[PDB]
Design a protein around this ligand. Structure first.
Ligand SMILES: [Zn+2]
Lengths: 157, 766, 46
C-alpha cells in the first residue's frame, strides 16, 4: 500500500506477458547477486481402526457370503459376555466412504421372532436406532445392540 | 560380437493376462527414432493400438501415439526421409502420421487410405529414385565422390519433371494391391486392383523396386508346398487417376519339399523378404515347422529365360522368430567382397535371425553361414538393424526393448588404425547423407577419440570447396558429439556449440542489413564489413566505425529493437571471454582463434552503429563507474587480443599489458554468468562396454531459452522444446508474434542448430 | 572501519573491504571510511 504502491502498479500492469519473468530477472538478479552473493549452497483402514479398538465382548468378523474387496463391506459380529445372554449374530453393511455417512443394520425379523425375549431385544434395538444421531459409527450400533440386550434382560426381570 | 547397450522395460504394466499375444511391428528411421507397438493389455485394448516413438538417445522418454486402429497394427514404415510414418492394420486403414509443429513428440495423421475389411499384409513407400553405393575399397581415396556414388536408379511414377511422386503401395490378404499417390497439394489418389485374375490367399507378401520404375511384389499363402508367386506392378497416372498394371513373373517352389527323405516337415513359410528394397532379384524365405526352420536365398538370374535358382540355405535351426535385413547399401561386387573380407568390414553383410530360444545369429547375406552368435541371458519378437548397421534394436516376448551393438568386424580383434578407418568411413557416410551417427558413437572407445577427430578434420580439408561449404555444421556437430566421449576431450564440446551459435548469429546479422544503395558494387555489405574490419586494425571503435558508410547499416527501429537479446549475448560473451583470459574453461579455445575474434569485432562494430541509430538495442553492462564507455573498452581489449592471432604463422602468447587490463575487468564491470549448451543427458557418455543399463520407461536415470536468449523463471510457466542431441531449450510458441525477428526464429523451426530434432518437454507443476 | 565476510563452500571464506561500493567504485558507503593497506595484510595470511 503506502510506500510500496508503484511496484505493485508496475507488476500488476505487466502480468500475462510471456517475457515477464525475463523482465524481473534482468531488472533484479544482478543487484541481488552482487549484494547477497551467489544463490543457495482392500478393506478401508477406518474400519480396521474401529475393529482394532473394540471391546472383547464383540467378535466382529467378515461374512463368508456377500461381495468382498469391493465398495461396501459386510460384517457378522457376535456377542460374548457372562452378564448378557446368547443372541442372534447381527449383520452389518458398511458402505464405502464410511465416515460422513451411517452404516446399515441388515434386519432379520424372522429370527427375532419365536421368543418373547428376542422380540424385546428387537423392539428396544429399533427404538435406540431411531434415537441415534446421524453419521454414527459402527461402534455406536454395536453398543446400542449391547445396551438393548441389557434392557431386554432387565425389563423381562 | 554383441553387447547389450541397454534394456528398457515397462514398470508394472507388463503381465498381460487372459488375452493372447499379437505380432509386433518395429521401424528404425533414418533419424534415430524407433516406432514400435507392444502388447500392453491393461484396462484397454488400445494399449495394444498405441505406437511408441522412442528417440534412441533418451529412451526413458517414450511418446505414445494413440492410433485409432480398430484392429491390430500389422505394418509400420518410415519415410525415405525420417519425417512421416505409415501404419497399417488389419481391416484396411493405412494412416500417414506426420509431425505436429515439427516436434518429434506430436504426431497426427491427416492422410490415409482404406480398403475396408481386407487386412494389409505388406506396405511400402514408393521409391524416390535416390540410391547410392559404398565402395569400401576406396575408403582412403580422399574424395567423397569416390567413396559413395549414386547408381542411376529410376523412381516409380515421375511427374512432370525429374520429381518423383510420394505415395505408398499396400498388398492385402486377398489378391488386392492399392497405390495411393500424394500430390504436392493435399490431394491423394487411390487405386486398388487385383494382382492376378485367379484371386487367392496372400498370407505373406513383400515389395521391392527395380530400375525402370517397376514394383515387384511377392506373394505366398503360407503353405510352403505352394509356389511363391511374383508380380510386376507398374504405376501410372492417367489424366486424373492412378492406374495399376500387373503382370505375372516366374514363381518359385521351395527346397525341403523335394528333399524326399522327410519332406513333410517345415510346412509353413513364415517370413518372405527381399534382401533389400531396390534389390528385387534376391529373395529370402524361411520355412518353419513347430520347432525347426530353414532360411533360403534365391535369385532370379537368367539363362525359360528367367528362372529362380537357389543360392544357399541353412542346415537346421531353431524356430526363427524375427528377421532383420541390413540397410547399409554396400556395393556387393567381387573386389569389394574381397577387400571387406581382408580388412574385416562386416556392417552390410549381415542379417540377424532371432530364434525361439534366447539366441540371435548374425549370418552372411550371400552364403548363409553364421558370422556371430549372441545368447540372451524369452525371445525377440521384433528386430531391426540400424541404418549404419552397427546396432540392432529388438522387442522381446515381454515388455523389454533392448539395443545391441554389433562390432564392425564381428568380434575379431583389429588393430586401431583399421578400426579408426572403419568408423571414419561410416561417419563420412553419415556426413554425406544426413543420417544420424549415434550408433557409431556406441562403438567409439575413449582412447581413440582424439585421433578420430584429427582424421575428420583432415577429411574436411582436401574436398572440393563446395563440400567444405555444405559439410560445415555437420562436422561441427560430429566433432562435438565425438569429443563428448572422452575425459581428456570433454572440455572442448562447449566451444564447438558456441562456435555454431556464433556463426548462427554472425551471418544472420549480416543477413539483416539490406544496403539501401549499391556503393562500391560487387561486394555485399557483409564482405565490405569484413574487409574494412580486417584492414583497419585501429584499437578505437570510433576509427573503425568512421570508415564504414554508416547510412547503409539501417534497420526499421522495430526489428532493431527486437534484436536486443542476441546483441546482449554478443556483448556478454565478449566480456566473459576477456575476463576469462587471465586463467581449461568454457572459453579456452576462442582466445587463440583469430577468425572468431574477428567475427566478434565485426559484431561489436555493427552493434555500435545500431546503438547510435537506436540506443535501446544495445547490451547493458552494470558498470562500477558512470563516466565509462564499456563497448569501447571491450573493443580495445578485443583488438589487442586479436592482433595477436591475425598474424601470419603467429601463435603469439598474449603480453602482460592485456593480462593486467583484463584483470581489471571484474573491477570495472560485472561478469554476469553464461549458459553453455550441451547439458549432457546422452546415454553414450554414460554407457560402458560389458555393462548394460537397465532402465524403466518414464523413469529417467537458471533455466534459459538458449536460442532466443530469454530468461525463464525458476519453474517456467510457458512450455518448451528440447533438442535431442545438444539439449538446448526453447519455448514452444514465440513470446511476441508481432515483434519477432523471423530471420532468426524461422531458422530453427524444424531443427536445432546442432541438427537434432525438437522434442516437447513436460511442465513441472511443483 | 568495515569488513565483509562471506562464508562459502569447502572451508573457504572471502573477505572484502566493506566501506567501498559493490557498484560505483569511487563512492564510499554512508558510515564507513575505507581501510588503507587492508589487501596486503590479508595476502600475508593467504
Ligand atoms: Zn541442438
Amino acid at each position: 500500500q503506502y510506500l510500496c504502491q508503484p511496484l505493485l502498479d508496475a507488476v500488476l500492469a505487466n502480468i500475462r506477458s510471456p517475457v515477464f519473468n525475463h523482465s524481473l530477472y534482468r531488472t533484479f538478479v544482478p543487484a541481488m547477486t552482487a549484494i547477497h552473493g551467489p544463490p543457495i549452497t482392500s478393506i478401508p483402514s477406518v474400519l480396521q481402526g474401529e475393529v482394532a479398538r473394540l471391546d472383547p465382548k464383540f467378535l466382529v468378523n467378515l461374512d463368508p457370503s456377500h461381495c468382498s474387496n469391493n465398495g461396501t463391506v459386510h460384517l457378522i459380529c457376535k456377542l460374548d459376555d457372562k452378564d448378557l445372554p446368547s443372541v442372534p449374530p447381527l449383520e452389518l453393511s458398511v458402505p464405502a466412504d464410511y465416515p460422513a455417512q451411517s452404516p446399515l443394520w441388515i434386519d432379520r425379523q424372522w429370527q427375532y421372532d419365536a421368543n418373547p425375549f428376542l422380540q424385546s431385544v428387537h423392539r428396544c434395538m429399533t427404538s435406540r436406532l431411531l434415537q441415534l444421531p446421524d453419521k454414527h459409527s459402527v461402534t455406536a450400533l454395536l453398543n446400542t445392540w449391547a445396551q438393548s440386550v441389557h434392557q431386554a434382560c432387565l425389563s423381562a426381570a | 560380437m554383441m553387447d547389450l547397450a541397454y534394456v528398457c522395460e515397462w514398470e508394472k504394466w507388463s503381465k498381460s493376462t487372459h488375452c493372447p499375444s499379437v505380432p509386433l511391428a518395429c521401424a528404425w528411421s533414418c533419424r534415430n527414432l524407433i516406432a514400435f507397438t507392444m502388447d500392453l493389455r491393461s484396462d484397454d485394448q488400445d494399449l495394444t493400438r498405441m505406437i511408441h516413438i522412442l528417440d534412441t538417445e533418451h529412451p526413458w522418454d517414450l511418446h505414445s501415439i494413440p492410433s485409432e486402429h480398430h484392429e491390430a497394427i500389422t505394418c509400420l514404415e518410415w519415410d525415405q526421409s525420417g519425417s512421416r510414418l505409415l501404419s497399417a492394420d488389419a481391416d484396411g486403414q493405412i494412416k500417414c502420421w506426420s509431425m505436429a509443429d515439427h516436434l518429434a513428440n506430436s504426431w497426427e495423421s491427416s492422410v490415409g487410405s482404406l480398403v475396408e475389411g481386407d487386412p494389409i499384409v505388406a506396405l511400402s513407400w514408393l521409391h524416390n529414385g535416390v540410391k547410392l553405393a559404398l565402395h569400401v575399397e576406396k575408403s582412403g581415396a580422399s574424395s567423397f565422390g569416390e567413396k559413395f556414388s549414386r547408381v542411376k536408379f529410376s523412381p516409380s511414377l515421375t511427374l512432370f519433371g525429374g520429381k518423383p511422386m510420394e505415395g505408398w503401395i499396400a498388398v492385402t490378404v486377398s489378391g488386392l494391391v492399392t497405390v495411393s499417390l500424394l500430390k504436392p497439394s493435399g490431394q491423394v489418389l487411390t487405386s486398388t486392383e487385383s494382382l492376378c485374375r485367379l484371386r487367392g490367399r496372400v498370407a505373406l507378401a513383400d515389395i521391392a523396386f527395380t530400375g525402370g520404375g517397376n514394383i515387384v511384389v511377392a506373394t505366398a499363402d503360407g503353405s510352403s508346398a505352394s509356389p511363391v508367386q511374383f508380380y510386376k506392378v507398374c504405376v501410372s497416372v492417367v489424366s486424373e487417376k492412378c492406374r495399376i498394371d500387373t503382370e505375372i513373373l516366374p514363381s518359385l517352389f521351395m527346397r525341403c519339399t523335394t528333399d524326399l527323405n522327410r519332406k513333410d516337415k517345415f510346412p509353413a513359410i513364415t517370413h518372405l523378404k527381399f534382401l533389400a528394397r531396390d534389390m528385387s532379384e534376391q529373395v529370402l524365405l524361411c520355412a518353419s515347422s513347430q520347432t525347426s526352420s530353414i532360411v533360403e536365398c534365391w535369385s532370379l538370374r537368367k539363362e525359360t529365360i528367367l528362372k529362380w535358382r537357389i543360392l544357399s540355405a541353412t542346415n537346421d535351426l531353431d524356430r526363427v522368430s524375427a528377421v532383420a535385413l541390413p540397410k547399409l547399401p554396400i556395393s556387393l561386387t567381387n573386389t569389394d567382397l574381397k577387400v571387406a573380407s581382408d580388412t574385416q568390414f562386416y556392417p552390410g553383410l549381415g542379417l540377424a535371425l532371432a530364434f525361439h530360444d534366447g539366441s540371435v545369429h548374425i549370418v552372411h547375406r550371400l552364403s548363409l553361414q553364421t558370422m556371430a552368435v549372441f545368447y540372451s541371458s524369452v525371445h525377440l519378437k521384433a528386430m531391426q538393424l540400424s541404418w549404419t548397421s552397427l546396432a540392432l534394436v529388438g522387442i522381446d516376448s515381454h515388455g523389454k526393448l533392448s539395443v545391441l551393438r554389433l562390432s564392425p568386424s564381428m568380434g575379431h580383434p583389429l588393430e586401431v588404425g583399421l578400426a579408426l578407418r572403419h568408423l571414419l568411413f561410416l561417419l563420412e557416410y553419415c556426413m554425406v547423407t544426413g543420417y544420424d551417427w549415434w550408433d557409431i558413437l556406441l562403438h567409439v572407445q575413449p582412447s581413440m577419440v582424439q585421433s578420430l577427430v584429427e582424421k575428420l578434420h583432415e577429411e574436411y580439408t582436401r574436398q572440393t570447396a563446395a563440400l567444405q561449404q555444405v559439410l560445415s555444421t555437420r562436422i561441427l556437430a560430429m566433432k562435438a558429439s565425438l569429443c563428448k566421449l572422452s575425459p581428456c576431450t570433454v572440455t572442448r564440446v562447449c566451444d564447438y556449440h558456441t562456435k555454431l551459435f556464433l556463426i548462427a548469429i554472425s551471418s544472420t546479422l549480416k543477413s539483416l542489413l539490406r544496403p539501401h544503395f549499391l556503393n562500391t558494387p560487387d561486394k555485399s555489405p557483409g564482405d565490405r564489413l569484413t574487409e574494412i574490419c580486417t584492414k583497419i586494425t585501429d584499437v578505437d571503435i570510433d576509427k573503425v566505425m568512421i570508415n564504414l558508410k554508416t547510412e547503409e547499416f539501417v534497420l526499421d527501429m522495430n526489428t532493431l529493437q527486437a534484436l536486443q537479446q542476441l546483441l546482449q549475448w554478443v556483448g556478454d560473451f565478449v566480456l566473459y571471454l576477456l575476463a576469462s583470459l587471465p586463467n581449461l574453461r568454457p572459453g579456452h579455445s576462442f582466445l587463440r582463434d583469430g577468425t572468431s575474434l574477428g567475427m566478434l569485432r565485426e559484431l561489436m562494430v555493427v552493434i555500435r552503429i545500431w546503438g547510435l541509430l537506436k540506443p535501446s538495442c544495445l547490451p547493458v553492462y552494470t558498470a562500477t563507474s558512470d563516466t565509462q564507455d564499456s563497448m569501447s573498452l571491450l573493443f580495445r581489449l578485443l583488438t589487442k587480443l586479436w592482433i595477436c592471432c591475425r598474424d601470419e604463422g603467429p601463435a603469439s602468447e598474449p603480453d602482460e599489458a592485456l593480462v593486467d587490463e583484463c584483470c581489471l575487468l571484474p573491477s570495472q564491470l560485472l561478469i554476469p554468468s553464461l549458459d553453455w549448451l550441451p547439458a549432457s543427458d546422452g546415454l553414450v557418455s554414460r554407457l560402458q562396454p560389458k555393462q548394460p543399463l537397465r532402465l524403466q520407461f518414464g523413469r529417467a536415470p537458471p533455466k534459459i531459452d538458449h536460442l532466443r536468449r530469454l530468461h525463464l523463471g525458476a519453474c517456467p510457466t510457458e512450455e518448451c522444446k528440447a533438442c535431442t542431441r545438444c539439449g538446448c531449450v526453447t519455448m514452444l510458441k514465440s513470446p511476441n508474434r508481432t515483434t519477432a525477428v523471423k530471420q532468426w526464429e524461422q531458422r530453427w523451426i524444424k531443427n536445432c542448430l546442432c541438427g537434432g530434432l525438437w522434442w516437447r518437454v513436460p511442465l513441472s507443476y511443483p | 572501519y568495515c569488513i565483509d565476510i562471506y562464508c562459502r563452500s569447502r572451508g573457504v571464506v572471502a573477505i572484502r573491504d566493506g566501506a567501498y561500493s559493490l557498484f560505483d567504485n569511487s563512492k564510499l558507503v554512508e558510515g564507513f571510511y575505507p581501510a588503507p593497506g587492508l589487501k596486503t595484510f590479508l595476502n600475508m595470511f593467504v
